[PDB]
Amino acid sequence: GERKISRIHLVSEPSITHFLQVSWEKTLESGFVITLTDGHSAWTGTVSESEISQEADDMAMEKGKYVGELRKALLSGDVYTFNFSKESCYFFFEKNLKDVSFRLGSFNLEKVENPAEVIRELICYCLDTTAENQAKNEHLQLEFNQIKAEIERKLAEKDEEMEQAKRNHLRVVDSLQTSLDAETRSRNEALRVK
Amino acid sequence: GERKISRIHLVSEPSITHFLQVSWEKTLESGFVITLTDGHSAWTGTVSESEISQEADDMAMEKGKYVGELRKALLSGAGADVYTFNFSKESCYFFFEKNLKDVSFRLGSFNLEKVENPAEVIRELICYCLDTTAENQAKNEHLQLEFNQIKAEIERKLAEKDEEMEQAKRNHLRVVDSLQTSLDAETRSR
């Protein structure tokens, strides 16, 4: 399965950055696990297929159109506003539009009894991902740098081959002209003196 | 400045993955700040030049070899080269040892103050990881585009350098072709 970890700002405590971790099997449509966390506590809730469909029908929305809204709100870091209450453990979010805003979702998140465990796993995921990405960066840059040197290496030969051809062209002409000029002047004077 | 977030296992609590965050300004030799965390609590300590040298001389070690050892144990540089980590919550004492065949000796020891607000420390850490991943993917997109662009630019510039040559040669031949004739004629007549 896959996951995505975004950072969101709640209307409550806008000063503090919260982290939102959404994981799903093959698609959001099939259901997903969502985790809200600060540096100390963590709240996890499971959103099923039926609850996705039901909140879509309470909104009177097409199902794939609604799932698209979940993707844009929960998986990408303006347009969307996030809210969480610690007492009722209730996480809801809205979509603001040109002086208009509508309730897009509401899910209950059970407070995790072992937050540090979840947090450690998250950090592990982040460290692995950044490592792999940095591994990709190094690889493609080495190939880029190596090819860039191997590109202009062909120019170095190709330019010289021109300069070679170029001087050769000159030399041949230089002889021919002289071989022409000499043969004109010398004999024509021998015609003029005899 | 730079930093390195490493993953270590303490001899106490081997089941739990601990995180070690080392930050430095120029190089480790000039000093570094070190932070241990289990996702709940955080212990941070600052290590100056003088203490690095002092612990190096108490071990009777040269600095460049010892600073090199810090790089191996604290920044995930290893073979194999087995390092062992220990932390005490009582004395706030984090020490680590290097291991060899049937031998293990104290390699370092630092005092780490327990941070009163671990959550901020943890959040900053996660933000760093997320930011780095963002920047790296941006660099990846850029470098792949440049790669494709510089690659297409090879077969284009080469193809025309061929033409400019092939053309230049043709002109030359034509020029030569006349000169040669003007020689033969001028020989023949005379």
Instruction: Answer yes or no: do B183 and A184 touch at CB < 8 A.
Output: no
Extract long-range pairs of B147-156: CB within 8 Å, 24+ residues apart.
Answer: B147/A140, B147/A143, B147/A144, B147/A147, B150/A144, B150/A147, B150/A148, B150/A151, B151/A147, B151/A151, B153/A151, B154/A151, B154/A154
User: Do A82 and A124 belong to one domain?
Assistant: no
Size of interface A-B (CB pairs under 8 A): 127
Nearest chain B residue to A137 by CA: give it.
B140
Answer whether residue A157 is part of any domain.
yes
Q: Rounded to an integer, what distance in angstroms lies between the CA atom of residue A8 and that of residue B96?
A: 38
Q: Give bridge partners of residue B86 from the DSSP assignment.
A: B95
- The answer to whether residues A128 and A168 belong to one domain is yes
Residue among B39, B169, B190 whose CB faces A119 most closely: B39
CATH number of the CATH domain containing B126 = 1.20.5.370
Same domain, yes or no: A92 and A130: no
Q: What is the DSSP string of B4-62?
A: EEEEE-BSSSTTSPEEEEEEESS-GGG-EEEEEE-SS-EEEEEE-HHHHHHHHHHTT--
Q: Rounded CA gap, A28 and A63, in Å? A: 11
From the list A123, A136, A148, the residue facing B150 with the nearest CB is: A148
CB B83 within 8 A of CB B62: no
Nearest Cα neighbor of A21 from A30, A11, A38, A50 is A38
Taking alpha carbons only, the member of A137, A146, A72, A135 closest to residue A104 is: A72
Inter-chain residue contact A172 with B172, CB threshold 8 Å: yes
CA nearest to B48, candidates B114, B125, B110 = B110
Cβ atoms of B53 and B65 within 8 Å: the answer is no
Residue A61 CA: distances (Å) to CA of A58, A92, B172 = 8, 17, 76
CA atoms within 13 A on the CB side of A23: 13
Q: Are residues B102 and B53 in the same domain?
A: yes
B161: enclosing H helix or E strand:
helix B118-189
Same domain, B90 and B51: yes
Count of positions (residues) in chain A: 194
Residues B165, A164: Cα–Cα separation, whole Å: 11
Whether the Cβ atoms of residue B71 and residue B56 lie closer than 8 Å to each other: no
Is there a contact between B179 and A173 if contact means CB atoms under 8 Å apart? yes
Please judge whether B183 and A176 are an interchain contact, meaning their C-beta atoms are less than 8 angstroms apart: yes
The answer as to whether A85 is a domain residue is yes
| Number of domains into which chain B is organized | 2
Within 13 Å, how many C-alpha atoms sit on residue B170's CB side?
6
Under an 8 A CB cutoff, do A161 and B164 touch? no
**Do the chains contact at B172 and A176, CB–CB below 8 Å?**
no
With respect to residue B52, please indicate whether it lies within any of the assigned structural domains. Answer: yes
Non-local CB neighbours of A5 within 8 Å, separated by 6+ positions: A19, A20, A21, A22, A122, A125, A126, B130
Residues A15 and A81 in one domain: yes
> CA A142: distance to chain centroid?
19
Amino acid letter for position B31: G
Solving technique for this entry? Answer: X-ray
User: Phi, psi at residue A69, to the nearest 5°?
Assistant: -65, -40
C-alpha span between B190 and B180 (Å, rounded): 16
Question: Do both A99 and A139 map to the same domain?
Answer: no
- What is the C-alpha separation between B182 and A183, in angstroms, rounded? 11
Alpha helices (H) along B109-117? none
Residue B127 domain-assigned? Answer: yes
Q: The domain containing residue B105 runs over which residues?
A: 1-117
- Kindly report the nearest CA distance between residue B56 and chain A, in angstroms: 31
CB–CB contact B140 A130 (8 Å): no
Residue B65: in which H helix or E strand, if any? helix B63-74
Tokens representing A167 are: 């001087």
- B117, B134, B149 — which closes off a domain? B117
In a domain, B142, yes or no: yes
Which residues in chain B are closer than 8 Å to A192, comparing Cβ atoms?
Answer: none
Tell me the shortest Cα–Cα distance from B9 to chain A, in angstroms: 13
Which of the listed residues A94, A114, A134 is the one where a domain comes to its end?
A114
Distance CA B49, CA B105 (A): 22
Query: Which residues neighbour A64 within 8 Å (Cβ) at sequence distance 6 or greater?
Result: A29
The residue among A15, A20, A117, A126 with the most chain B CBs within 10 A of its CB, best to mutate, is A126
B44 and B136 both lie in a single domain: no
Q: Which residues of A touch B121 (CB under 8 A)?
A: 39
Which of A124, A140, A141 faces B17 most closely, judged by CB atoms? A124
Quick one: which H or E segment has residue B124? helix B118-189
State whether B88 and B140 are in the same domain: no
What CA–CA distance (Å, rounded) separates B131 from B125? 10
Helices B49-58 and B63-74, interaxial angle, to 10°?
Answer: 100
The distance of A151 to chain B (nearest Cα, Å) reads 6
Residue B189 lies in a domain: no
Residue that finishes a domain, picked among B102, B117, B132: B117
- Please indicate, yes or no, whether residues B155 and B87 belong to a single structural domain of this protein: no
Q: Could you give the CA distance from residue B17 to residue B39 in angstroms, rounded to a whole number?
A: 9
Residue of B nearest to A141 (CA): B143
One domain, residues A86 and A153: no
Nearest residue to B95 (alpha-carbon basis) of B76, B111, B77, B75: B111
Q: Do B120 and A184 touch (CB under 8 A)?
A: no
Give which of A169, A170, A173 is closest to B180, Cα–Cα. Answer: A173
With CA atoms as reference, the chain B residue closest to A120 would be: B39
Query: Cα B23 to chain center, whole Å?
Result: 14
- A140: nearest CB among B123, B143, B153: B143
The verdict on A96 and A133 lying in the same domain is no
- Does B172 reside within a domain? yes
Q: CB–CB of A39/A118 below 8 Å? A: no
Residue B96 sits in a domain of what CATH number?
2.170.210.10
**Does residue A179 form part of some domain?**
no
- Return all residues near A10 (Cβ < 8 A) that are at least 6 apart: A16, A18, A82, A83, A84
Q: Which residues have C-beta within 8 Å of that of residue B76, sequence separation ≥ 6?
A: B4, B6, B7
In the block, tokens 């080269």 appear at B81
Instruction: Please state the three-class secondary structure of chain A as a single string.
Output: CEEEEEEECECCCCCCCEEEEEEECCCHHHCEEEEEECCCCEEEEEECHHHHHHHHHHCCCCHHHHHHHHHHHHCCCCCEEEEEECCCCEEEEEEEECCEEEEEEEEECEECCCHHHHHHHHHHHHHHHHHHHHHHHHHHHHHHHHHHHHHHHHHHHHHHHHHHHHHHHHHHHHHHHHHHHHHHHHHHHHHHHC
Q: Which of chain B's residues have a Cβ under 8 Å away from the Cβ of A126?
A: 126, 129-130, 133
